[PDB]
Design an enzyme around this catalytic site. Structure first.
Site, PDB file in Angstrom:
ATOM      1  N   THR A  25       2.671   0.155  -2.857  1.00  0.00           N
ATOM      2  CA  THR A  25       3.213  -0.522  -1.687  1.00  0.00           C
ATOM      3  C   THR A  25       2.441  -1.780  -1.318  1.00  0.00           C
ATOM      4  OG1 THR A  25       1.895   0.676  -0.060  1.00  0.00           O
ATOM      5  CG2 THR A  25       3.889   1.736  -0.881  1.00  0.00           C
ATOM      6  N   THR A  26       1.294  -2.025  -1.944  1.00  0.00           N
ATOM      7  CA  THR A  26       0.534  -3.248  -1.722  1.00  0.00           C
ATOM      8  C   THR A  26       0.868  -4.313  -2.759  1.00  0.00           C
ATOM      9  OG1 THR A  26      -1.228  -1.832  -0.868  1.00  0.00           O
ATOM     10  CG2 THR A  26      -1.779  -4.115  -1.307  1.00  0.00           C
ATOM     11  N   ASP A  86       0.506  10.093  -2.026  1.00  0.00           N
ATOM     12  CA  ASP A  86       0.626   9.116  -3.106  1.00  0.00           C
ATOM     13  C   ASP A  86       0.508   9.795  -4.466  1.00  0.00           C
ATOM     14  OD1 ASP A  86       1.013   7.096  -1.325  1.00  0.00           O
ATOM     15  OD2 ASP A  86      -0.854   6.027  -1.752  1.00  0.00           O
ATOM     16  N   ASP A 137      -3.298   2.597   2.708  1.00  0.00           N
ATOM     17  CA  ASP A 137      -1.953   2.438   2.177  1.00  0.00           C
ATOM     18  C   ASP A 137      -1.309   1.190   2.764  1.00  0.00           C
ATOM     19  OD1 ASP A 137       0.404   2.826   0.884  1.00  0.00           O
ATOM     20  OD2 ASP A 137       0.924   4.715   1.868  1.00  0.00           O
TER      21      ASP A 137
HETATM   22  N1  LIG Z   1     -10.059   2.776 -12.252  1.00  0.00           N
HETATM   23  C1  LIG Z   1      -9.422   1.594 -12.084  1.00  0.00           C
HETATM   24  N2  LIG Z   1      -9.885   0.465 -12.660  1.00  0.00           N
HETATM   25  C2  LIG Z   1      -9.262  -0.714 -12.502  1.00  0.00           C
HETATM   26  N3  LIG Z   1      -8.146  -0.874 -11.770  1.00  0.00           N
HETATM   27  C3  LIG Z   1      -7.573   0.175 -11.140  1.00  0.00           C
HETATM   28  C4  LIG Z   1      -8.196   1.496 -11.263  1.00  0.00           C
HETATM   29  N4  LIG Z   1      -7.438   2.344 -10.548  1.00  0.00           N
HETATM   30  C5  LIG Z   1      -6.420   1.627 -10.011  1.00  0.00           C
HETATM   31  N5  LIG Z   1      -6.504   0.334 -10.360  1.00  0.00           N
HETATM   32  C6  LIG Z   1      -5.564  -0.743  -9.968  1.00  0.00           C
HETATM   33  O1  LIG Z   1      -5.508  -0.907  -8.552  1.00  0.00           O
HETATM   34  C7  LIG Z   1      -4.209  -1.379  -8.201  1.00  0.00           C
HETATM   35  C8  LIG Z   1      -3.823  -0.920  -6.802  1.00  0.00           C
HETATM   36  O2  LIG Z   1      -3.697   0.497  -6.769  1.00  0.00           O
HETATM   37  P1  LIG Z   1      -3.845   1.294  -5.382  1.00  0.00           P
HETATM   38  O3  LIG Z   1      -4.703   0.467  -4.460  1.00  0.00           O
HETATM   39  O4  LIG Z   1      -4.271   2.702  -5.721  1.00  0.00           O
HETATM   40  O5  LIG Z   1      -2.358   1.395  -4.773  1.00  0.00           O
HETATM   41  P2  LIG Z   1      -1.447   0.115  -4.436  1.00  0.00           P
HETATM   42  O6  LIG Z   1      -0.829  -0.251  -5.760  1.00  0.00           O
HETATM   43  O7  LIG Z   1      -0.471   0.655  -3.422  1.00  0.00           O
HETATM   44  O8  LIG Z   1      -2.416  -0.903  -3.898  1.00  0.00           O
HETATM   45  C9  LIG Z   1      -3.264  -0.867  -9.275  1.00  0.00           C
HETATM   46  O9  LIG Z   1      -2.430  -1.935  -9.725  1.00  0.00           O
HETATM   47  C10 LIG Z   1      -4.151  -0.411 -10.412  1.00  0.00           C
HETATM   48  O10 LIG Z   1      -3.828  -1.137 -11.598  1.00  0.00           O
HETATM   49 MG   LIG Z   2      -1.989   3.149  -5.657  1.00  0.00          MG
END
Ligand SMILES: Nc1ncnc2c1ncn2[C@@H]1O[C@H](COP(=O)(O)OP(=O)(O)O)[C@@H](O)[C@H]1O
Ligand SMILES: [Mg+2]
Ligand SMILES: Nc1ncnc2c1ncn2[C@@H]1O[C@H](COP(=O)(O)OP(=O)(O)O)[C@@H](O)[C@H]1O
Ligand SMILES: [Mg+2]
Lengths: 525, 540, 106, 98, 49
Positions: free
Chosen positions: A94-95, A391, A61
């Protein structure tokens, strides 16, 4: 600098002013964004931070990582603050906030270096952010059918997308179904304190369970507790806030007698007070007794003789969850233990869970609360599982509030960048450069996904740009297939409010950083 | 390659971001993964020598100099003063295996080390660590399904306990109690079966009392269907043996009553003093008379008593024990079938516990006396009394018997078993290899690496027994493939046969499943960490 | 004076005023000889609590009676400047009668 | 403070309890509601009783808040709820409001 | 009166989401089980409950 006989400010005051100061601010913002850069997307990685005490923490996170780093640069703390704000208001993304803010600053750095007035940049950011938020609200997909199965599927997909970046991503469907059920069981306020999370060491992730009721750890049983039965098939639960012990009547109470039979009467009166409390509890009809205050050994043996269950020093949150699940009331006095103030559950049982004893209240049909029992091989393993579940829970709650979704994987931001570039092509030209820089900075998230997963970012970005320009809204990064794909049909769904708040917070942070021209540091007291 | 970044700005102005950034450190990318894999490999290689019947122990010294010779992997890792975070993760993994199962605490560490070594090789070949983790998870799922497929069921009935004895013997084979192997296994099985809710419910571990006393021999260790008490009879002239004792459990000190509330009894005249003295005397007399009226023979108290009560108990032919702890009071009440009475006024005959024999036991030239309560009718609590030539073997026997009890508990919870000696690991590796052939190419490497990491346990067992690892493991695998028999393992004891089913090497299925699961999850979490930020302060 | 009325309901401006300069402690005071209270029930405790402020209430009631005797209408007013403290109970009692009071004067 | 028995009997009669720790907030609430701060547990007389259009528990962002809300666009005290993404930004907005 | 205007700062949604409320807001929680009243009859006590 001529040394004045009497200085203006205190000796040791540090002042930095001008273009170099703001350039340094931007550089520090990129330094902060680098520390969370690789924790994005399904191919993200965890970070390990060891504090002074030597207790490490492992997290994916962004907000947690930023909080654990002790950032002291005044301009860099804005990124941590906006990460905290995104965590508080939304709970996810949050990233992306930090990457977006740092990318905005990086894109406008060359214009700052050439003496551009920062007010122009701030105005351009405000305009671009307003347009992007309006576009997000306009193109967000919502279904006006109020279908229960469709709502369940939407929430499950959103929870899976929120969960597909953590160490529990392999069991993401399982955990998403659990989280959706947990959020449904909450009544109207979706209070987080009504979702208990218990972490028990040992066991696989698939051994985690959601109990439709309340479960809490055994709390320092006294002698004679093992003589009590540990399974009830239709118990009535007496939720109490009462100290069932032999003790002084009051702290300031003093007893003055001058005869031996008065002494004996006083002793028997104390015993009779305790037995009166216990007898009222017993004749209330209850079989399971829980108290926030301690329950002594005498009461424990008394309940053992009656084949009753007692548990003292129960935490207040656990008592609240038990009251919500079973439907009683935490009584501070036992004088009126009627049927309406007694909880009721189908099955009560104490079982062995990974080297610990847990009391289970199951079979509650009107339960408005739930308890997660998370299993893992390490303390930080279960902590990060809890963070991932938090989350997912926040995402599902916000989606309950409104069912507006936009395809993830950078598709929404590519669409926003295309729209902003199209808008910027039709303005005089001084704001055109800055709005185009904003649109270019919007491309950071898909680029970061491609970099983390090990793709070639440039080719995927070119394909995404061509696909968006030629027609197509929900085309994002496909991590597994080494290419791009329609992320809406791939069920990469995130609530629109996540991206709305991300853009708003990133824009506000960038504007605040740019608006500053001088930094003054007084000597530490 | 530490402190993070250092630029001091393009303009020469100070560039301070992290507090104490000049003293901190950080590792990034594949280098951090390589360091973590090296740490886990070191821990696993240290642990791998203590695997199997021929495994050797580790002599562990704590801060104050206390010495614990042990073979338990969880105990060893708990007493190590490690500083690396990955080492702490390995310790946590072993402790988690101990908590969930209680057996196999050394297999998980070796398996995790092998998995991380294969992951290191794959990383050097240029694969994303998340891909390696996904392949490991898929192979673990395949192996767990195969373990479910090749398992066997055993009877957990009291009438025939031979499979339980064999399983406990297999558990105890690697420990120092293998000299008294069958006796230890039998007493552990009897202890678990005695204190257990039969309908597949939990086995409650506060109903088993484990105490060790120095002297005697390990063969003198016995199962007591009652309670052993560190106390003795209060009066020195009380009889040392009571037959058909009717116990009277009391939690009230044999003293004049004292109200909890702040009280002051005012003596205003000589008549008041006489009344007070007579009241005290009558209180003592009537408490003794109330105890005697129920017909009890032995009185057990928790809070002790004073001289007058002691002599009155002696005079009325009432042996008594004082200052018995609360847990021991509960155990005595459970075993003898009596109830705990909080005051003499409530003491009745129906609340008395019955014990066939209560005796005081001497222990040589030591002045130490301990009380035996046994020969109960339907004692629902049991006690294990361990003897030995030194305290260290006593502690080792304690933990070995705990392992045996945990194993029988696992059998009670789930009666499916698989055959040890590396046969299960070899079969799982074969199943994973067969699955990888049909699977696409990219994760085929991860699945093959998982199979190779699984094959470490037979290799470790064969190496510990002096045989050649690769030759023996290859021969056993070829025999397993040629004829369908997943029970062929490593002949550690050189009995002439490789069939562990004939050799009666039996393991709980849930134990192996937990081993594989925990190893896979811990390896995944370690592989996903690509950044370390230590303070680097090295404080005093 | 560098201090004002300590009760929010006190009048902020009095047109025609009678000034009562006093050096009488209108706040609660303790017995010099270590009094202490002994009761055996909650009702007795409430009675003792109600009866322990009679001494202060007597002087407060004397002030109230003087005010009601002097100015029976609302045209005039009383200002009480006290060199010693006035507890919130006495402040409330005086404010209920439309009397502005000052405490801890020099 | 609130006694345990008092909280019990308040829950039994469906009475909402709010514990204002600072006396400035108590005075401001008395002004905005129209009540009198009683120094004893005596039941409030008709004039001393305070009135409000709605009192409820709500969550804004991640903070639990208790809201004393009037439906009418008038009253003794009015409040401004400032949202933001940074504490410093809200402090600047508060200075502008001042 | 200047002091009659109160400012409550709640993090999360950007300053564009700010609003004015005819009343007061306290960053606290209710002591009891009741969490909502529609016809409030507040009784204020300066003494402990
Ligand atoms: N299955 C997936 N395939 C492609 N992109 C994804 C998938 N799941 C999440 N993402 C992308 O990863 C990004 C980061 O999400 P995540 O790391 O879960 O939390 P955060 O937004 O806090 O970094 C999101 O903007 C989302 O669009
Ligand atoms: Mg996320
Ligand atoms: N008699 C035996 N013959 C062959 N292998 C054995 C025998 N007894 C135990 N083993 C093997 O030794 C391995 C290690 O067991 P042990 O050291 O007792 O506990 P742990 O599993 O915690 O290391 C087990 O996997 C088991 O298969
Ligand atoms: Mg073993």
């Amino acid at each position: 600098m001529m040394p004045t006989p009497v200085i203006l400010l205190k000796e040791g005051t540090d002042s930095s002013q001008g273009i170099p100061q703001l350039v340094s601010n931007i550089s520090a913002c990129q330094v902060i964004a680098e520390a969370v850069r690789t924790t994005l997307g399904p191919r993200g990685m965890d970070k390990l931070i060891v504090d002074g005490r030597g207790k490490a923490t492992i997290s994916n996170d962004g907000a947690t990582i930023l909080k654990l780093l002790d950032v002291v640069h005044p301009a860099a703390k804005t990124l941590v603050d906006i990460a905290k704000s995104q965590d508080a208001e939304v709970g996810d993304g949050t990233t992306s906030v930090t990457l977006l803010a740092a990318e905005f600053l990086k894109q406008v750095k060359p214009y700052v270096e050439e003496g551009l007035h920062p007010q122009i940049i701030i105005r351009a950011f405000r305009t671009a952010t307003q347009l992007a938020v309006n576009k997000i609200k306009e193109i967000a997909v919502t279904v006006k059918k109020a279908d229960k199965v469709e709502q369940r599927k939407l929430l499950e997909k959103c929870a899976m997308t929120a969960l597909s970046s953590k160490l529990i991503s392999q069991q993401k469907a399982f955990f998403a179904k659990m989280v959706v059920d947990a959020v449904m069981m909450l009544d109207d306020l979706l209070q987080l304190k009504m979702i208990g999370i218990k972490k028990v060491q040992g066991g696989a992730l698939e051994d985690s369970q959601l109990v439709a009721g309340v479960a809490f750890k055994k709390t320092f049983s006294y002698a004679g507790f093992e003589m009590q039965p540990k399974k009830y098939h239709n118990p009535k639960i007496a939720l109490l806030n009462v100290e069932l012990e032999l003790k002084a009547e009051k702290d300031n109470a003093e007893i003055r007698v001058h005869t031996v039979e008065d002494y004996q009467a006083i002793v028997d009166a104390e015993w009779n007070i305790l037995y009166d409390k216990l007898e009222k509890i017993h004749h209330s009809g209850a079989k399971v007794v829980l108290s926030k205050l301690p329950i002594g050994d005498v009461a424990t043996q008394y309940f053992a003789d009656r084949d009753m269950f007692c548990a003292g020093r129960v935490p207040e949150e656990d008592l609240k969850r038990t009251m919500m699940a079973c439907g009683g009331s935490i009584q501070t006095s036992v004088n009126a233990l009627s049927a309406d103030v007694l909880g009721r559950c189908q099955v009560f049982e104490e079982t062995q869970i990974g080297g610990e004893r847990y009391n289970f209240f199951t079979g509650c049909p009107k339960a408005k609360t739930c308890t997660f029992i998370l299993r893992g091989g390490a303390e930080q393993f279960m902590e990060e599982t809890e963070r991932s579940l938090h989350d997912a829970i926040m995402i599902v709650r916000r989606a309950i509030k409104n069912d507006s979704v936009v395809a993830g994987g950078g598709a929404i931001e590519m669409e926003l960048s295309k729209y902003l570039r199209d808008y910027s092509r039709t303005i005089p030209g001084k704001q055109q450069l800055l709005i185009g820089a904003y649109a270019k900075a919007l491309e950071i998230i898909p680029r970061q996904l491609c970099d983390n997963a090990g793709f070639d970012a440039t080719n995927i970005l070119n394909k995404l740009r061509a696909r968006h320009a030629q027609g197509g809204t929900w085309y994002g990064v496909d991590i597994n297939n080494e290419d791009i794909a329609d992320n809406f049909e791939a069920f990469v769904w995130e609530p629109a409010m996540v991206r709305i708040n991300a853009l708003t917070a990133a824009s506000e942070a960038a504007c605040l950083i740019v608006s500053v021209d001088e930094t003054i540091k007084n000597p530490r007291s | 390659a530490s402190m993070g970044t250092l630029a001091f700005d393009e303009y020469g102005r100070p560039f301070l971001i992290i507090k104490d950034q000049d003293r901190k450190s950080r590792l990034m990318g594949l280098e951090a993964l390589k360091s973590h894999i090296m740490a886990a490999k070191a821990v696993a290689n240290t642990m791998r020598t203590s695997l199997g019947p021929n495994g050797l122990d580790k002599m562990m010294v704590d801060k104050d100099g206390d010495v614990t010779v042990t073979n338990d992997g969880a105990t060893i890792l708990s007493m190590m003063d490690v500083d690396h975070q990955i080492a702490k993760l390995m310790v946590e993994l072993s402790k988690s295996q101990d908590d969930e199962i209680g057996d196999g605490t050394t297999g998980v560490v070796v398996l995790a080390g092998a998995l991380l070594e294969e992951a290191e090789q794959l990383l050097d070949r240029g694969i994303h660590p998340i891909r390696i983790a996904d392949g490991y998870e898929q192979a673990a799922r395949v192996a767990i399904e195969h373990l479910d497929k090749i398992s066997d069921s055993v009877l957990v009935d009291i009438k025939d306990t031979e499979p339980l004895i064999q399983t406990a013997k297999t558990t105890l084979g690697s420990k120092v109690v293998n000299s008294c192997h069958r006796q230890m296994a039998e007493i552990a099985v009897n202890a678990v079966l005695t204190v257990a809710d039969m309908e597949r419910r939990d086995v409650d571990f506060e109903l088993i009392k484990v105490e060790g006393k120095v002297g005697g021999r390990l063969e003198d260790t016995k199962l007591i269907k009652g309670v052993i008490v560190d106390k003795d009879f209060s009066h020195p002239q009380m009889p040392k043996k009571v037959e058909d004792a009717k116990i009277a459990i009391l939690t009230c000190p044999f003293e004049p009553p004292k109200p909890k509330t702040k009280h002051k009894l005012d003596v205003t005249s000589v008549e008041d003093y006489k009344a007070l003295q007579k009241y005290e005397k009558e209180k003592f007399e009537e408490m003794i008379q109330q105890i005697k009226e129920t017909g009890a023979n032995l009185a057990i108290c928790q809070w002790g008593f004073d001289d007058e009560a002691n002599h009155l108990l002696l005079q009325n032919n009432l042996p008594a024990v004082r200052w018995v702890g609360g847990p021991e009071i509960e155990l005595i009440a459970i075993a003898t079938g009596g109830r705990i009475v909080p005051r003499f006024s409530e003491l009745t005959a129906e609340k008395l516990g019955f014990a066939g024999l209560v005796q005081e036991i001497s222990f040589g030239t030591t002045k130490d006396k301990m009380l035996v309560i046994e020969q109960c009718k339907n004692s629902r609590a049991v006690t294990i009394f361990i003897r030995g030539g030194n305290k260290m073997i006593i502690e080792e026997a304690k933990r070995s018997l705990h392992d045996a009890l945990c194993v029988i508990r696992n059998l009670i919870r789930d009666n499916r078993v698989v055959y040890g000696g590396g046969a299960a690991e070899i079969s799982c590796a074969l199943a994973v290899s067969q699955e990888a052939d049909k699977c696409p190419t990219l994760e085929q490497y991860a699945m093959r690496a998982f199979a190779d990491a699984l094959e470490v346990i037979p290799m470790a067992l064969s190496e510990n027994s002096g045989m050649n690892p690769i030759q023996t493991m290859t021969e056993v695998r070829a025999r397993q493939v040629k004829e369908m028999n997943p029970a062929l393992g490593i002949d550690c004891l050189h009995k002439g046969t490789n069939d562990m089913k004939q050799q009666h090497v039996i393991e709980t299925l849930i134990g192996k499943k937990q081993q594989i699961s925990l190893a896979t999850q811990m390896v995944r979490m370690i592989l996903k960490i690509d950044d370390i930020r230590k303070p680097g302060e090295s404080e005093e | 004076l560098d201090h004002g009325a300590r009760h929010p309901d006190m009048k902020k401006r009095v047109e025609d005023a009678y000034i009562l300069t006093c050096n009488v402690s209108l706040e609660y005071e303790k017995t010099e000889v270590n009094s202490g209270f002994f009761y055996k029930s909650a009702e007795e405790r409430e009675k003792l609590v109600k009866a322990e402020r009679k001494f202060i209430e007597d002087r407060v009631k004397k002030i109230i009676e003087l005010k009601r005797k002097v100015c029976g209408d609302s045209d005039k007013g009383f200002v009480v400047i006290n060199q010693k403290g006035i507890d919130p109970f006495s402040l409330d009692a005086l404010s209920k009668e439309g009397i502005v009071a000052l405490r801890r004067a020099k | 403070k609130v006694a345990d028995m008092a909280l019990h009997y308040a829950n039994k009669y469906n009475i909402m309890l709010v514990r204002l720790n600072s006396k400035w907030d108590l005075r401001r609430l008395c002004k905005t509601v129209g009540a009198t701060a009683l120094p004893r547990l005596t039941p409030p007389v008709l004039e001393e009783m305070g009135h409000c259009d709605s009192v409820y528990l709500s969550e804004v962002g991640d903070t639990q808040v208790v809201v004393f809300k009037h439906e009418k666009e008038d009253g003794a005290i009015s409040t401004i709820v400032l949202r933001g993404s940074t504490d410093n930004l809200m402090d600047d907005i508060e200075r502008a409001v001042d | 009166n200047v002091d009659n205007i109160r400012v409550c700062k709640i993090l999360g949604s950007g300053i564009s989401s700010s609003s004015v409320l005819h009343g007061m807001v306290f960053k606290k929680e209710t002591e009891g089980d009741v969490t909502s009243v529609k016809d409030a009859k507040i009784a204020v006590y300066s003494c402990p409950f």
